[PDB]
């Protein structure tokens, strides 16, 4: 239905331990497809999904050149902002960016973004209208000034409306057999007795994609969430995800409880019991 391509930049200074490290990862939906680490023996943009490997030499030349220029650029950013804030020469500082685009079921632009963050906090972002900036503070407004005076917004719009969407559509095609396909969760229930009076019922959802999922417990068909123990959804490492949900129940009342699971890959909701 609806798809997204996003890039994630991170620069981290390390005073008296070398120049700031720069790291990038590209994503389509919940699928990482490209990566870059400036601390690699030979810093290249590298493929992390089958359907980009096929890209020609000229592509990787371009991508790597952008990553190398990014690390230079962001290092300047770190230095400039350090001055605005007039900070001590002591510890580390970070500069992050997240940008990309969403396209609807119709394959047309839905909304574009290009956010920057200094030390884990919003610093400056491109408004959804793609011609203005939101500065989070005194410093960021100085940045805002320079970017408006240089016509940076227009350039961003050009990439976001055109280039960014084009690529996304291209990736959707070339890797359709996995990107366009949803994997249903593989559900089960485990039985972990605490004592002769209480036992834990944990409800597992495994090997699913994408990560958007819903788990819940019911008693006699009625909810009871403030009681349930979750874990955040975690990757299995194979491009699928895991998650469980437990409730502590009275030894003997296990029949009362059912686990309920909804996922994009299910034709219809599922109900498990112990």
């Amino acid at each position: 239905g609806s798809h997204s391509m996003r890039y994630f930049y991170t620069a981290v200074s390390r005073p008296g331990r070398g120049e700031p490290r720069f790291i990038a990862v590209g994503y389509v939906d919940d699928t990482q497809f490209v990566r870059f680490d400036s601390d690699a023996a030979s810093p290249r943009m590298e493929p992390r999904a089958p359907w980009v490997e096929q890209e020609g030499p000229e592509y990787w030349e371009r991508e790597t050149r952008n990553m190398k220029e990014a690390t230079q650029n962001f290092r300047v950013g770190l230095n400039t902002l350090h001055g605005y804030y007039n900070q001590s020469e002591a510890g580390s500082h970070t500069l992050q960016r997240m940008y990309g685009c969403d396209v609807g079921p119709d394959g047309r632009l839905l909304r574009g973004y290009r956010q920057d963050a200094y030390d884990g906090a919003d610093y400056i972002a491109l408004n959804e209208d793609l011609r203005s900036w939101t500065a989070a503070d005194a410093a960021a407004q100085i940045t805002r000034r320079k970017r408006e005076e240089a016509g940076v917004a227009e350039q961003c719009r050009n990439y976001l409306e055109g280039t960014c969407v084009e690529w996304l559509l291209r990736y959707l095609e070339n890797g359709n057999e996995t990107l366009q396909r949803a994997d249903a969760p593989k559900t089960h229930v485990t039985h972990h007795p605490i004592s002769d009076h209480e036992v834990t019922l944990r409800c597992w959802a495994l090997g699913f994609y994408p990560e958007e999922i819903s788990l819940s417990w019911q008693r006699d068909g009625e909810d009871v969430t403030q009681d349930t123990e979750f874990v955040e959804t975690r990757p299995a490492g194979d491009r699928t995800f895991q998650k469980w949900a437990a409730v502590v129940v009275p030894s003997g009342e296990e029949q009362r409880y059912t686990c309920h699971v909804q996922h994009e890959g299910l034709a219809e909701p599922v109900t498990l019991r112990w």
Binding site: A150, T163, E166
Partner: peptide
């Protein structure tokens, strides 16, 4: 497709 740098010597 990553975004090309951005001209202007004025990014930060």
């Amino acid at each position: 497709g990553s975004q090309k740098l951005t001209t202007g010597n004025c990014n930060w």
